[PDB]
Every structure is written in structure tokens, then in C-alpha cells.
Ligand binder design. Structure first.
Ligand SMILES: [Cl-]
Ligand SMILES: [Mg+2]
Length: 236
């Protein structure tokens, strides 16, 4: 028999982290982040990383595990995720992998000794997701996104071409700091970059099988999610 596992994916800004925390309060879960950007320390505001307080009450594996000067491959994610899942399983906890880095999920499924239930969340209308993406980005700037990048920009061991700086929006803020862009251009292009990411994620998701879709605007996703576990033959 194979131990249970949950995958919670979807495009950026869909509210995945929100639902993960809810599920974490209904079942004994072990939150595991599947995000090539959240792995970096010092990149919290621009990455929409859960606050230090929220992480305290909802611990996430694979968050803040690398310095921005370091690289992280899908191969390393695979090994770390398998380790975290086995560790949670041994404790009777249900591995709950939440995030939108499809390349990571792919490496795990292909290159799994688990009976996986796969959940996905997003708005029915992409226009709803787009508006939130623009608003969320503008708020990041208000909460100190620029100051956050200034600290990275000041490091001689970091440059704009690094893997870490590929996290959406960071390069635009970096260029702004280089005096190459106006505040307006930095904002518009960071939003475009993020909208572009969602587009790439949707492409991956539309071709993915065994996905139980949920609506970001729905108010009862918890009960709906808890109900699906049985469909995939998982008794929890
Ligand atoms: Cl994220
Ligand atoms: Mg999130």
C-alpha cells in the first residue's frame, strides 16, 4: 500500500497558500513548498512569501533554504521533496505540496511511491486573476519591494543574470535601480512578467491529468477539497 500525499497547484495569485493553510487545520499535514522562488532567503516581499508569523503557525518545507547567490535544480527539488515527504509520512503526517513551479511537480511524478490527490485552484475568468496580479504587485512596492531588491543589488556576489533574480518582477526592480527604467515602466513590466508566468502555468495545467479543479472565488473550497480525497481512493 502507498502512503497518501496531496498536490495543491495553480497559477500565481490563485490563492493556493490560502487553501493549504485551511487544509492544514483540517488534517495532519506537512506543508511542502513547490516554488523555485520561495527557496531564497531575502526574497520575501516580491515573492509573496508567507509572513514570518504565518510560517510560524504554518511551517513550510523548502522555503528559505538557499542564499540568492546559489542555484537550485529540479533534481535537487526532487531529492529534497522526497526526503521531506518520507519524513512527514513516518510521522503519520500527510505531505501537502503547494506551489506553482510545474517543472518541480513534473520531476517528482516523472524525473512516486505515494497515492497522490492532485488539486488545482484558479478563477474561472482569467481577467479576475489578472486584476489581482496587478494589484498585488503594486502592494509589494508599497510594502518594501524596492528596498528588498536594493539589498540584493548592493551585493557584489549577485548580478541581474542569476537564477534567483529570475523570480518574476525582480529583474524589473533591479533595472529600475540601475537607472534603466522609470518607476512606471518597472511597474508595468513587472506585472506583464507575472501575467506571463500565469500564462505559462495555465499551459502546463491544461495538459495535466488527474486534476480536481477549484474556484478561487468559491467560499467552500475546504469541504470540497476534503471530499475529493476519497475519489482518488484515499482513506483519511
Ligand atoms: Cl509563491
Ligand atoms: Mg503562495
Amino acid at each position: 500500500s502507498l502512503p497518501p500525499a496531496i498536490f495543491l497547484m495553480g497559477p500565481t495569485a490563485a490563492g493556493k497558500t490560502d487553501l493549504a493553510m485551511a487544509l492544514a487545520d483540517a488534517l495532519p499535514c506537512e506543508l511542502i513548498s513547490v516554488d523555485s522562488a520561495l527557496i531564497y532567503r531575502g526574497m520575501d516581499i516580491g515573492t509573496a512569501k508567507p509572513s514570518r508569523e504565518l510560517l510560524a503557525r504554518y511551517p513550510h518545507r523548502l522555503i528559505d533554504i538557499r542564499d540568492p547567490a546559489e542555484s537550485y535544480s529540479a533534481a535537487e527539488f526532487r531529492a529534497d521533496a522526497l526526503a521531506a515527504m518520507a519524513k512527514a509520512t513516518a510521522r503519520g503526517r500527510i505531505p501537502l505540496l503547494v506551489g506553482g513551479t510545474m517543472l518541480y511537480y513534473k520531476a517528482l511524478l516523472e524525473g512516486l511511491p505515494y497515492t497522490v490527490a492532485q488539486l488545482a485552484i484558479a478563477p474561472e475568468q482569467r481577467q479576475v486573476l489578472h486584476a489581482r496580479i496587478a494589484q498585488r504587485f503594486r502592494q509589494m512596492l508599497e510594502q518594501g519591494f524596492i528596498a528588498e531588491v536594493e539589498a540584493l543589488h548592493a551585493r557584489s556576489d549577485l548580478h541581474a543574470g542569476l537564477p534567483s533574480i529570475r523570480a518574476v518582477g525582480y529583474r524589473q526592480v533591479w533595472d529600475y535601480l540601475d537607472g534603466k527604467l522609470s518607476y512606471a515602466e518597472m511597474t508595468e513590466r513587472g506585472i506583464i512578467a507575472t501575467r506571463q508566468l500565469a500564462k505559462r502555468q495555465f499551459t502546463w495545467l491544461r495538459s495535466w491529468s488527474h486534476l480536481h479543479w477549484m474556484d478561487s472565488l468559491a467560499g467552500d473550497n475546504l469541504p470540497r477539497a476534503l471530499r475529493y480525497l476519497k475519489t482518488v481512493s484515499i482513506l483519511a
